[PDB]
């Protein structure tokens, strides 16, 4: 799955500063990793529809945070999308 | 022509008939009777009287082979399921023990509309 070893690796990479755990950049990074863990789990297991629902909720939440970043500070939005390869 | 003098006795009691088989301690049968072996023909076979007479007919057949000790097995529920046992204890055959081995599935097969 997603162990706390790999979790801390992402938080410390996308933190705006030491100690930051809940920035919008950190939430989108963590959301994006679980996207790629599920999209690869859904390449196989194409008949798993109840897990398919959770993925739509994560995509909706990821796009909900990016749409917010777009409005406030568009620069950090571009530096984030370019760093995660989205859109 | 066997001289067993000990063995098992199975009682298969249904709501439509009650039938008794007498065997040896390995399972192979010696004689047997039922509600139809005696004169009863139709629904009268599922009655306790027929269940009693069928039990006693097999018991006297087992006396021919010399049966004295008898272990009793019972399968199924129905009229005369108890009257056959009570007939077997006083049939001269010293009843050793009585076990109920009615096969109950783990919900494996779909029953007929009757049983649902």
């Amino acid at each position: 799955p997603i162990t706390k070893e790999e979790k801390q690796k992402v938080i410390q990479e996308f933190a705006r500063f030491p100690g930051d755990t809940g920035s919008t950049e950190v939430q989108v990074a963590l959301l994006t990793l679980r996207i790629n863990r599920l999209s690869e789990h859904l390449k196989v297991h194409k008949k798993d529809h109840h897990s398919h629902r959770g993925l739509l909720m994560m995509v909706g939440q990821r796009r909900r945070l990016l749409r917010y970043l777009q409005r406030e500070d568009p620069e950090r939005y571009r530096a984030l999308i370019e760093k995660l390869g989205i859109r | 022509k066997r001289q067993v003098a000990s063995g098992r006795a199975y009682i298969h009691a249904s709501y439509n008939n009650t039938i008794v088989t007498i065997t040896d301690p390995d399972g192979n049968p010696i004689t047997w009777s039922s509600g139809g072996v005696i004169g009863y023909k139709g629904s009268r076979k599922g009655t306790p009287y027929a269940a009693q007479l069928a039990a006693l007919d097999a018991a006297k057949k087992a006396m021919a082979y010399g049966m004295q000790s008898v272990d009793v097995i019972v399968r199924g529920t129905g009229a005369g399921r108890e009257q056959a046992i009570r007939a077997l204890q006083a049939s001269g055959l010293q009843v050793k023990s009585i076990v109920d081995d009615t096969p109950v599935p783990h919900n494996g097969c779909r029953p007929k509309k009757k049983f649902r």
Binding site: - | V74, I85, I98, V99, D100, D101, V104
Partner: protein, 70 residues
């Protein structure tokens, strides 16, 4: 009547290999006793049911037995 947990010690509810104690929780037949007879809690009985089924597949607890009465 006494209950199973009442007359017992401090035991591992997740140990499927301890037949001596799990034989106490089976009836005369191989069936699993209801909560009214085991004196267990809701969460305890759920764990016991799983650990009994494990012991059944290991040949340690019987699936079903024969009643000697009637």
């Amino acid at each position: 009547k006494a209950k199973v947990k009442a007359t017992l010690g401090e035991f591992d509810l997740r140990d499927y290999r301890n037949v001596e104690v799990l034989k106490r929780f089976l009836s005369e037949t191989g069936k699993i006793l209801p909560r009214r007879r085991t004196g267990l809690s809701a969460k305890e009985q759920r764990i016991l049911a799983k650990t009994i089924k494990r012991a059944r597949i290991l040949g340690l607890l019987p699936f079903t037995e024969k009643l000697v009465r009637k």
